[PDB]
């Protein structure tokens, strides 16, 4: 890995990997459970109102 | 009256201040209403009885 | 698949539900995942077995 | 241990330029940190090496 200039490609998908592993986790708890909590309430709303 | 009202107006944003961090750490800011929650745990029994 | 095969405008409520409870979280995912990626965007620093 | 042994007004202004500082940060790190661990509060599901 010293000569990361050497080699660009491999650096960036590392970044990447990670990048996206984190976001995974916060993207799960907040949006993701968000919507199976509130997605329900909107549904019985929207088709009561309509 | 008048004389402690700016202090005491200061004071209450203040409290606001903290009544509102509570609210993100504990409950992470999750609006909660009655008819919410009477729905959403209709639906659990719901789907039990499925 | 479900039982709203027919009926397009109420599975047209149901959809717009589903994209009006996603707009509404998007914003705050996205920002709290750049919060959360802060301390890679200094300094990702990449382990060698990644 | 530094030559403001003496001077403790010099050494009060160093000192009190420390403690601005960090009570300038203070808020931004733990509101940050409170959020990044927000996915850690939901599930902080534990692997065996853990």
Not at chain 1, 7 to 35: I, S
Not at chain 2, 20 to 47: G, R
Not at chain 3, 10 to 31: E, N
């Amino acid at each position: 890995l010293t000569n990361k200039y050497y080699c660009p490609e491999v650096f960036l998908d590392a970044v990447a990997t990670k990048l996206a592993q984190t976001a995974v986790l916060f993207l799960n708890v907040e949006m993701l459970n968000d919507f199976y909590v509130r997605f329900p309430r909107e549904v019985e709303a929207k088709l009561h109102e309509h | 009256m008048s004389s402690k009202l700016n202090e005491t107006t200061e004071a209450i944003q203040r409290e606001l201040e903290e009544t509102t961090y509570q609210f993100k750490v504990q409950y992470n800011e999750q609006p909660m209403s009655a008819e919410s929650y009477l729905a959403a745990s209709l639906d659990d029994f719901k789907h039990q009885f499925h | 698949k479900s039982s709203f095969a027919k009926h397009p405008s109420a599975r047209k409520v149901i959809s717009d539900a589903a994209a009006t409870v996603l707009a509404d979280r998007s914003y705050a995912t996205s920002d709290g995942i750049e919060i959360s990626l802060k301390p890679y965007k200094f300094d990702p620093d990449i382990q060698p077995n990644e």
